[PDB]
């Protein structure tokens, strides 16, 4: 619906959508097209913004320019960040191990006042990484994402803390700039500036040049304030400048002239101290001043401070209604740091802009030196300019920094959520350990902005959110949510956007409104969201705003969970968390029961290939698709065939459209890794039965029918990348060549003469992937243990060849080995409702609870799980599934059945395998399914299988008897989860040990052991199993004689030698003797000894 | 081609350099102020070597980060004791994903046959060379590597009443570790007993358990005698049975025994 070429999904939508879900992956593209001077954003800003919208590069260059050596004799001013076309295609950039970037130019002039006038010119700095239409960067040939960072905005935060000593509340204010010193106001320490502990609040006022009568007039209301103005040794101005001079810095001779200039440099000067347009705007709107004032404002010099102290004074006075002279009237209350009106969102554009700023500041010093050392006039700024400190500042942002993450390519949705992410941790925010329990909890302002379901399950619970489907980021960097305006209980078709502080000042009504075509309210009063985001109930007189659509608040992953409202937030959270780890399958099929969001999410995610222009398909190949457009020119889209995605899974694409076929603009042509006819298809539709089955499903385990493993329905493709190189070490020079001296011939078979494996050769754990030689000894690349399968493709990056290569290394070789993972025992499965599980048992097709028509059910999920876990969703999802697969011509009635009184759009008939849409609030109702199961569907034979209640009488394949009561069978969408035995399973009898510690390693890659912790020792000692523990902590780990002696003794079949001398004790004895402590172990009686 | 060294080397080098200079200052006959300054700097260097960041500013090498002194290798959360001396990774040990194996007796468990084959790799070789299955120990070590049909009939003979210690981190109580008899099962999953999940606190929702192989006769014995599930039914806490019907078996036996009127026969 409203999408050209998609498989029509019949909808359980009770309410007609007034707005169409906006282009997903917006926050990346809008921000990045803001950062650089882009025409689309330019025109968007012309449509909604000021007459002259300044681009991020332009405004950082404006914030830098001009550079002077104080004097103002020599000047340098950059402008006009003009770009060319991109360096190469994305696929080529991923291929050649280079950065997908754009060459960057600036119109720079070197003004020289005393000498002759120098002209302007175009300066080239270097390549700047640009964002693809998939809203990602390709750094060093890997597809990296910049996640959006939640940070406390620059602005003025008022707070009230209850005193421990006295029974009197304390009002604390805290302003915080974009780049500068912290100013903070406190009631009685009075004011702190640049760690100047304890100063009277009036001093900084007096320093601004405020005479007594102006203190009495401005700060007349409230007590203490006047007593704080009174309480000071230096009442006079010059005295106060000397006082604050002495307080600011104890060292350096303090002069009155110097004090004023340093004060006015530290809190008035725009370059040294910087409060951004967000900060200026926030303090302006919160104080109420500069109402109808443009951008490009400066620091809070004086006029703000008066407003803040007045606001504080009124906050003490206890009267909300306030008006400041030369400012708009704002209400007086405490400011909440959790409220999203106060929490801004710094996005890719700004997060890059900061590093461009820091890099340009790093450049400004080098320029300031360069122009100082170089000759006057005869210098040339194009001639003398350092490129390093910016390219370094950018390269170092995408090199190792936490906010520049590897894109989650477990599927499209994983990517879409990864790019639509709100991170509270990292540089500029709060550290994971430092962050308290208050910051993590959801806040009523989160609604329709940050997902109050989706979050990681690890130590980052509530910290890393996901931005909500409909929410969009402002040029400022605030999270605006769309809503509908209502005039006197009559809703409008207009869509407005709210920043949160206005929504706080207004009343918002909920999306389940009694909606007729007119939209005039019939329900006398509706449930509404109050000023403090509290759930209230009011008549249409109070209601000014209403929720545009249901599922405002959900992320894309959260949105793609049908009957979410019947699930609990905890299991839903887990449902999303695991859904964005759901692996693509060799034959993906779209859910028979879903929401409409699956259709939309895939085509926006950008991993599917979309038809850029309206045309007719010219010819279809597996390699590429060529479309002949209306105009005459053709588009040839090249499909990435079996590309290793970042998280190890495959990114296989296929064409869906036929040769003789017309295709509209914005239509699905190719098939992504998790699309089948353009729809977010992660897992499969399987016939589930819900019951206990002979203890194989006990404690939320899952039972498979071998049919799945045989038919290859849940079979994935997993590609492990293996990288090795020939770097010229000081000894000689490394080589990638077939021939090694001390090897067998039979193992040197898969390799060709050059020393790489031939393409498609199946590898057993121990096989050679790259023949490499060290200066000759052998250091060849062998396939790691647990990994097997078919070699997709070999890449080579020769020193002689043009390819961009790391520093020192000559010839890089990467290997793609693909294992076709068949859903075996011990692999993780999960639904969409958080109902996880390990595959307890794969039954042979026949011994499987089967339908009266002879179809064996695929999975059996344990019943006891459901009421405990509190996620009945999966059962409604299951039920509807049966209605989805089993087509239903409802003999409606001569006067319509009650359940179908509020029946959705023409959803009375449905053919076999009818894929149904049910949104996460305006979806399929409780009793509807009771009507939907009561539906004739003679599956080949002239009989119904499932009853009115939705249960079926199953025959036990194993026993052969029928089950004594009818069990809840139905079709369920289940997801192949990434928590795989190829990741998790690990064994070690013996193996290769570490050099530093003398205990076995950790990890499957190095063939490590398994960690025997303290808590295991506690339990061993609780048993009192001295020998077991003392065997575990000596020969099994440490003792070098011990391990070889016990191996030798085991293989010989002799008594195990008594473990004598642990390495740990030697280490600690030697280490204690290194710190000059003489430690000697005495016996019960006699002389002491060394251990050996 | 890069060299990985220890910070100690820098500090010892400083100390020995300062010492060897001071020696030459004594040899030449330098003024007492120079010599005493050298002695002060030496004192500072040795002081820093024994404990860095103990007095004033610490010594920093690459990028203004303080070097780990000798006392730094015996202090802090990550020096010794808290991590290094208390917990470490071991041999003759594995870790897999757990699944319910409801066929099994309480003393029995199930092992993934490959994982098992790797976990008893010597004990199988011993029997494979003690029998005329492998001609020589090297050839046995090849045959176990190739995983040939002749080892599987032996692995039952080697695993016959040979206990293994199942442990789940975090180990919250004594019954958090339990010994079992490993049955050899196909697949990639550890088949846990449904009764020991109350003890282990282990839901089958992607949780993983470590297996350990006691080697010494004493360890093997103690595994069989103390920490065998069949022995540890009652809680150390109270003495209420923890290895008891739970979740499913409860509803099963409850339905089985519940006497309801108005029924057939």
């Amino acid at each position: 619906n409203s999408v050209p070429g998609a498989p029509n999904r019949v909808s359980f939508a009770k309410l007609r959508e007034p707005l169409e879900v906006p282009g997903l992956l917006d926050v990346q593209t809008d921000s990045f097209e803001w950062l650089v001077g882009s025409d689309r954003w330019r025109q968007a800003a012309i449509d909604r913004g000021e007459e002259n919208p300044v681009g991020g590069l332009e405004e950082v260059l404006a914030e830098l320019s001009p550079i002077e050596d104080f004097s103002g004799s020599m000047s340098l001013s950059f402008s006009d960040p003009r770009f060319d076309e991109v360096k190469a295609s994305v696929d080529e950039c991923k291929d050649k191990d280079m950065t997908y970037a754009a060459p960057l130019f600036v119109t720079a002039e070197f003004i020289n006042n005393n000498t002759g006038e120098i002209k302007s010119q175009t300066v080239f700095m270097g390549d700047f990484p640009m964002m693809t239409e998939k809203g990602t960067f390709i750094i060093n040939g890997t597809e990296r994402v910049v996640v959006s960072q939640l940070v406390r905005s620059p602005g003025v935060y008022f707070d009230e803390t209850i005193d421990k000593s006295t029974e009197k509340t304390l009002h604390s204010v805290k302003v915080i700039p974009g780049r500068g010193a912290w100013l903070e106001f406190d009631v009685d320490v009075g004011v702190r500036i640049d760690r100047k502990r304890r100063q009277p609040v009036t001093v900084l006022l007096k320093a601004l040049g405020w005479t007594n009568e102006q203190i009495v007039e401005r700060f007349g209301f409230s007590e203490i304030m006047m007593g704080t103005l009174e309480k000071d040794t230096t009442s006079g101005t010059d005295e106060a400048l000397l006082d604050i001079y002495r307080k600011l810095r104890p060292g350096e001779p303090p002069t009155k002239e110097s004090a004023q200039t340093l004060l006015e440099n530290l809190f008035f000067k725009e370059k040294r101290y910087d409060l951004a347009r967000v900060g200026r705007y926030k303090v302006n709107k919160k104080l109420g001043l500069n109402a109808g004032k443009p951008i490009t404002s400066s620091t809070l010099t004086e006029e703000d401070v008066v407003a803040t102290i007045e606001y504080l004074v009124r906050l003490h006075e206890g009267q909300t209604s306030m008006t400041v002279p030369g400012g708009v009237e704002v209400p007086v209350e405490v400011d909440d740091i959790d409220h999203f009106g106060n929490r801004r969102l710094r996005t890719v554009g700004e997060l890059i802009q900061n590093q461009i700023r820091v890099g340009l500041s790093r450049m400004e010093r080098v320029v300031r030196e360069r122009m100082t050392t170089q000759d006057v006039e005869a210098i040339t700024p194009q001639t003398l300019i350092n490129i390093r400190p910016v390219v370094a500042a950018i390269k170092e942002f995408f090199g190792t920094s936490q906010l520049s993450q590897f894109m989650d390519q477990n599927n499209p949705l994983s990517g879409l959520t990864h790019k639509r992410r709100l991170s509270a941790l990292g540089p500029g925010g709060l550290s994971r350990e430092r962050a308290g329990l208050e910051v993590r909890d959801v806040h009523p302002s989160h609604y329709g902005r940050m997902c109050p379901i989706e979050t990681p399950e690890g130590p980052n619970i509530g910290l890393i959110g996901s931005l909500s489907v409909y929410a969009r980021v402002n040029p400022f960097g605030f999270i605006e949510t769309p809503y509908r305006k209502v005039e006197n209980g009559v809703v409008t078709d207009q869509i407005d956007y709210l920043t949160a502080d206005e929504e706080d000042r207004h009343v918002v009504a909920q999306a389940n409104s009694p909606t007729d075509e007119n939209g005039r309210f019939t329900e006398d009063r509706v449930m509404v969201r109050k000023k403090g985001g509290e759930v209230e109930f009011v008549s249409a007189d109070q209601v000014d705003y209403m929720d545009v659509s249901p599922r405002q608040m959900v992320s894309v992953a959260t949105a793609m969970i049908p009957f979410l409202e019947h699930d609990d937030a905890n299991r839903a959270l887990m449902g999303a968390n695991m859904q964005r780890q759901a692996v693509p399958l060799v034959r993906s099929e779209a859910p028979l029961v879903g929401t409409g969001m699956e259709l939309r999410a895939a085509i926006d995610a950008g991993d599917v290939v979309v038809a850029d222009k309206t045309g007719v398909i010219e010819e279809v190949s597996a390699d590429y698709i060529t479309v002949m457009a209306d105009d005459g020119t053709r588009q040839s889209y090249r499909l990435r065939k079996f590309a290793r995605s970042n998280h190890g899974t495959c990114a296989n694409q296929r064409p869906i459209v036929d040769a003789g076929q017309r295709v509209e603009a914005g239509q699905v042509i190719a098939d992504g890794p998790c699309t089948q006819n353009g729809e977010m298809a992660l897992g499969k539709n399987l016939l589930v039965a819900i019951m206990p089955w002979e203890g194989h499903n006990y404690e939320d385990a899952i039972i498979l029918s071998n049919r799945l493993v045989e038919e290859d329905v849940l079979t994935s493709i997993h590609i492990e990348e293996h990288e090795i190189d020939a770097r010229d070490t000081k000894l000689g020079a490394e080589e990638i060549t077939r021939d090694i001296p001390n090897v067998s011939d039979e193992v040197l078979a898969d390799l060709d003469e050059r020393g790489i494996v031939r393409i498609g050769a199946e590898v057993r754990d121990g096989d050679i992937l790259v023949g490499k030689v060290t200066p000759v000894r052998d250091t060849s690349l062998k396939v790691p243990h647990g990994e097997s399968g078919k070699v997709i493709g070999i890449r080579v990056f020769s020193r002689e060849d043009d390819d961009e290569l790391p520093a020192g290394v000559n010839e890089l070789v990467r290997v793609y080995v693909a294992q076709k993972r068949k859903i075996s025992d011990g692999d993780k499965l999960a639904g969409r409702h958080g109902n996880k599980g390990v595959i307890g048992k794969i039954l042979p097709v026949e011994d499987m609870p089967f339908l009266p028509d002879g179809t064996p059910v695929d999975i059996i999920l344990n019943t006891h799980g459901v009421p405990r876990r509190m996620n009945i969703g999966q059962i409604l999802e299951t039920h509807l599934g049966w209605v989805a697969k089993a087509g239903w011509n409802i003999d409606v009635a001569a006067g319509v059945p009650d359940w179908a009184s509020k029946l959705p759009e023409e959803l009375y008939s449905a053919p076999a395998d009818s894929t149904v849409a049910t949104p996460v609030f305006d979806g399929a109702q409780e009793g509807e399914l009771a009507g939907l199961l009561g539906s004739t569907l003679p599956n080949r034979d002239g009989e119904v299988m499932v009853d009115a209640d939705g249960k079926s009488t199953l025959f036990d394949g194993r026993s052969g008897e029928p089950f004594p009561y009818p069990v809840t069978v139905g079709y369920m969408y289940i997801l192949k989860l990434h928590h795989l035995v190829d990741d998790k399973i690990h064994a070690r009898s013996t193996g290769p040990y570490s050099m530093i510690t003398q205990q076995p390693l950790g990890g499957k890659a190095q063939f490590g052991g398994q960690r025997f912790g303290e808590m295991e020792c506690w339990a061993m000692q609780a048993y009192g199993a001295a020998y077991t523990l003392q065997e575990l902590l000596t020969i099994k780990s440490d003792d070098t004689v011990g391990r070889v002696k016990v191996y030798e003794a085991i293989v010989k079949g002799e008594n195990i030698p008594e473990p004598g001398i642990p390495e740990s004790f030697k280490v600690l004895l030697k280490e204690l003797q290194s710190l000059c402590l003489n430690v000697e172990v005495l016996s019960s009686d006699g002389a002491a000894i060394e251990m050996r | 081609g890069r060299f990985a060294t220890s910070d100690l080397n820098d500090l010892y080098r400083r100390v020995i350099n300062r010492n060897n200079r001071l020696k030459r200052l004594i040899d030449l006959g330098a003024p007492e102020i120079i010599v005493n300054n050298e002695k002060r700097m030496l004192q500072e260097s040795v002081d820093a070597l024994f404990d860095n960041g103990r007095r004033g500013r610490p010594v920093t090498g690459p990028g203004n980060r303080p070097l780990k002194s000798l006392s730094d290798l015996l202090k802090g959360k990550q020096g010794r004791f808290r991590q290094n001396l208390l917990g470490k990774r071991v041999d003759y040990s594995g870790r897999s994903v757990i699944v319910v194996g409801p066929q099994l007796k309480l003393h029995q468990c199930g092992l993934p046959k490959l994982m098992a084959l790797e976990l008893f790799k010597p004990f199988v070789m011993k029997r494979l060379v003690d029998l005329n299955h492998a001609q020589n120990i090297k050839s046995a070590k090849r045959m176990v590597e190739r995983q040939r049909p002749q080892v599987w009939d032996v692995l039952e003979e080697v695993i016959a009443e040979h206990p293994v210690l199942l442990n789940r981190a975090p180990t919250l109580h004594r019954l958090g570790i339990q010994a079992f008899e490993p049955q050899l099962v196909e697949g990639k999953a550890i088949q846990l007993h449904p009764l020991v999940c109350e003890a282990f606190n282990a839901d089958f929702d992607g949780d993983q358990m470590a297996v350990h192989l006691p080697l010494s006769a004493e360890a093997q014995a103690e595994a069989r005698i103390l920490m065998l599930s069949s022995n540890n039914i009652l809680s150390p806490a109270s003495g209420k049975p923890l290895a008891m019907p739970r979740l499913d078996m409860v509803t099963g036996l409850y339905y089985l025994t519940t006497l309801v009127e108005g029924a057939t026969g």
């Binding site: 000692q1021 048993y1023 199993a1025 001295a1026 020998y1027 | -």
Partner: peptide, 24 residues
């Protein structure tokens, strides 16, 4: 020293009984 590590445990001489020896 706890459990099976006390001197009364770690030092135990287990001989086969005089009646069991001759019987073999």
């Amino acid at each position: 020293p706890a459990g099976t590590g006390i001197s009364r445990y770690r030092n135990i001489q287990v001989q086969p009984t005089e009646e069991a020896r001759a019987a073999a």
